[PDB]
Amino acid sequence: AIPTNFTISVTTEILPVSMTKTSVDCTMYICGDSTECSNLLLQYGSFCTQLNRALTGIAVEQDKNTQEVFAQVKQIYKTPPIKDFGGFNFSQILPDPSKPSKRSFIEDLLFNKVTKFNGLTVLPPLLTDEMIAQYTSALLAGTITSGWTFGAGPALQIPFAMQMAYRFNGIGVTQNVLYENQKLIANQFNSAIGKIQDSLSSTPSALGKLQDVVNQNAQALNTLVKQLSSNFGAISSVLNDILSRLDKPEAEVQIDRLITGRLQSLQTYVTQQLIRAAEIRASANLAATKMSECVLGQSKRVDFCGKGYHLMSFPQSAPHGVVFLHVTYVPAQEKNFTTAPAICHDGKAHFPREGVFVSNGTHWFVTQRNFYEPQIITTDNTFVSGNCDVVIGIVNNTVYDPLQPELD
Amino acid sequence: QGVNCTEVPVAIHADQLTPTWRVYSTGSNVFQTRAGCLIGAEHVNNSYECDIPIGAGICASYQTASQSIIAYTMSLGAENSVAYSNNSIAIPTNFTISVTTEILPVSMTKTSVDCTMYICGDSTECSNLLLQYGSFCT
Amino acid sequence: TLVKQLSSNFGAISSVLNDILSRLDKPEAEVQIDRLITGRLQSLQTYVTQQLIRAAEIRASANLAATKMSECVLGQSKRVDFCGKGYHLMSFPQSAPHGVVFLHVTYVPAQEKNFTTAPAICHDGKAHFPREGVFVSNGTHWFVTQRNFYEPQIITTDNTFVSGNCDVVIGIVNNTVYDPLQPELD
Ligand SMILES: CC(=O)N[C@@H]1[C@@H](O)[C@H](O)[C@@H](CO)O[C@H]1O
Ligand SMILES: CC(=O)N[C@@H]1[C@@H](O)[C@H](O)[C@@H](CO)O[C@H]1O
Ligand SMILES: CC(=O)N[C@@H]1[C@@H](O)[C@H](O)[C@@H](CO)O[C@H]1O
Ligand SMILES: CC(=O)N[C@@H]1[C@@H](O)[C@H](O)[C@@H](CO)O[C@H]1O
Ligand SMILES: CC(=O)N[C@@H]1[C@@H](O)[C@H](O)[C@@H](CO)O[C@H]1O
Ligand SMILES: CC(=O)N[C@@H]1[C@@H](O)[C@H](O)[C@@H](CO)O[C@H]1O
Ligand SMILES: CC(=O)N[C@@H]1[C@@H](O)[C@H](O)[C@@H](CO)O[C@H]1O
Ligand SMILES: CC(=O)N[C@@H]1[C@@H](O)[C@H](O)[C@@H](CO)O[C@H]1O
Ligand SMILES: CC(=O)N[C@@H]1[C@@H](O)[C@H](O)[C@@H](CO)O[C@H]1O
């Protein structure tokens, strides 16, 4: 069976890259502003210091994760004032310069969809949303105007349609297919992008992978805070109520009960955050890998870039992650043909060159795989190896020699 | 961090702290960023590569911007415009052979701890109590 | 940290087991000792937990290093930026105290020039496409170059192929395709 047509499919892949950079003042969380409590907490040595270091390390990694995924381009590339890309319309994924906050249309959908402390603080990221958008824009500008060349050195300009021709060739489809069907391909592409807008707006769970990270972190903090009122066997969950009621030798006992419980609760929080951090780090490493292999090149890895044969990938920013729009070639409308491994001609076994021998029942042709474009069997598109008593499925036919009519 | 410039951070020196501490309350060198109140750095309207990251796009560095610490919004890289057209192609005429180094950790120090010794040392009484904690040591 | 915690004195009269045992009687020492046991056990559990988490990080790094060894040293990776910037040619491993160092040798396409191009050549009504190359021009003559180096050849029937007529391709330009058989016969 060989496809006679194809479609251009665009799919989205959602990957988390970073977490909220929380930090906890262990002494304040456990002891508040109580001097007596702090004096007892010191008897637990370095536990507080160690917890502070663990959270600090996590917060640092969150910027490292973002940096590795997005800052893969040495220069910030801009698009031309004239967006002529051979019929391919990227206006829904590229920034809109008339509004100095953009973030392209698709990105805006992503940001719109995804949605008072006691020792607890939240640190800002080093890279702001605008800075991330600039990196994304540069990657898109590079991809569109210089293909993958900018990912291996200097950006080398190339007409977009010609870039696509190379991407088609890279999946086993001859360049002529693109140029002959360029309008169809551009239209299939443009429609596929429009569908992405509807897909994201229609499905409320489309970005669940990013929302889950946010929700998990929120729950971890809600639990950490609620534990302050637990009263771990003490007469009261409030340090001030213990201290205002009991004398020193009695309060110390009640306070120690709360310190142990609160320290254990905080250690639990930090441990869970370290485990979650490793999950996010792995995701960020994957996102960074995809950026390099899908956006800055043409991956040949199966289902590493959505289903189908990979052509292109267009990154989009998101609150705590990255979104990849994977453009793939998917075969369509196959027909059944009769085939053979070789043609028997004058006792010689002829094998195809980068193609397959097919038949409609009356005539045999050499056709390229993954598209169907039958050619006459000649000595230019075949090669000879051995006699015809070896190949099992060999069939008898005539191989055309284009020199004959030039001489005779 | 999270502090409003000149409003809040100028509370502590109310206790008359060391002259080399209270200096960090002087104006001009006070810059407000989303990360908090930065005191002692000179804010500039220039841009450079990240050196010492502060947060929210702000970084600091030491310049010799002469013999001082400055604060700035970091650059994301040089601006570049590809000469895209319908028929212009750039093609390399030369090349270089670049050798780069990549460092990867493979292993850690193979430490091991004798739980009983760490906790109880050579004390018999302590070991007898430690046994009440079941398999934790194992 | 694990060692320093031994002197913490987790609510006990002393951080030293011997001083407690040499000072208090049995029923009193047991209480003070239990305070230290709980604190030291908790400190040790903390250490081990952190080591397991850190160990996972190193294991992941080792798995990546092993992957790179196989794909960069024992072969030629085609994965972008998996072997440094540029097009991968070779990788040479070097040992290190607790890790591995890779020297990645890559090809970088320096010194580009601006050429005029086209997707196809129109010759006698036939649309000629390049074979593993691109059609370029210096403004007076068209050539076939290999990508990533620039090495212009004459456009012939040996380095091109024909598909369809010339009313389909958008950017097609008119030129002469050389047929090397002609001078052999005429
Ligand atoms: C050879 C062939 O069937 N081409 C069809 C084209 O006629 C149709 O208009 C288009 C959808 O609009 O889908 C293509 O696959
Ligand atoms: C599906 C799609 O891409 N539609 C775009 C439209 O949004 C844009 O305003 C117009 C500008 O020429 O170009 C079309 O191709
Ligand atoms: C691509 C194609 O034509 N496949 C047909 C299939 O639809 C049909 O059902 C079967 C006979 O049952 O013969 C196959 O060759
Ligand atoms: C079984 C069948 O379809 N045979 C057709 C033949 O009728 C046609 O004349 C020829 C092109 O000229 O192409 C063959 O595939
Ligand atoms: C490629 C080929 O010739 N395959 C033949 C098949 O057509 C035939 O129906 C079958 C009978 O057993 O024997 C196979 O070897
Ligand atoms: C099954 C069949 O047709 N076999 C014939 C064989 O008898 C003939 O000798 C040869 C040409 O020499 O061509 C093969 O196709
Ligand atoms: C650093 C900061 O947020 N300062 C705000 C100031 O911007 C605001 O205008 C004022 C009320 O008018 O209250 C201050 O606390
Ligand atoms: C936005 C801004 O801070 N601009 C300052 C300007 O106020 C100052 O007078 C000048 C002195 O050289 O340096 C510019 O960077
Ligand atoms: C064609 C060309 O420019 N080749 C130059 C060569 O002349 C020069 O000597 C060398 C550096 O020593 O760098 C090469 O790229």
Ligand SMILES: CC(=O)N[C@@H]1[C@@H](O)[C@H](O)[C@@H](CO)O[C@H]1O
């Ligand atoms: C490789 C090359 O020659 N690039 C040139 C660029 O230097 C020049 O600035 C631009 C016109 O402004 O035209 C490009 O083709």
Ligand SMILES: CC(=O)N[C@@H]1[C@@H](O)[C@H](O)[C@@H](CO)O[C@H]1O
């Ligand atoms: C515009 C231009 O450079 N044209 C030159 C031409 O003068 C030269 O004679 C020919 C080689 O013989 O190569 C062409 O590229």
Ligand SMILES: CC(=O)N[C@@H]1[C@@H](O)[C@H](O)[C@@H](CO)O[C@H]1O
């Ligand atoms: C490959 C090609 O011919 N591109 C032409 C371009 O040269 C021309 O300047 C433009 C005018 O709108 O129309 C494009 O189709």
Ligand SMILES: CC(=O)N[C@@H]1[C@@H](O)[C@H](O)[C@@H](CO)O[C@H]1O
């Ligand atoms: C813009 C242009 O030059 N078009 C000519 C066309 O008029 C001519 O008919 C054809 C050869 O038949 O060659 C094309 O290059």
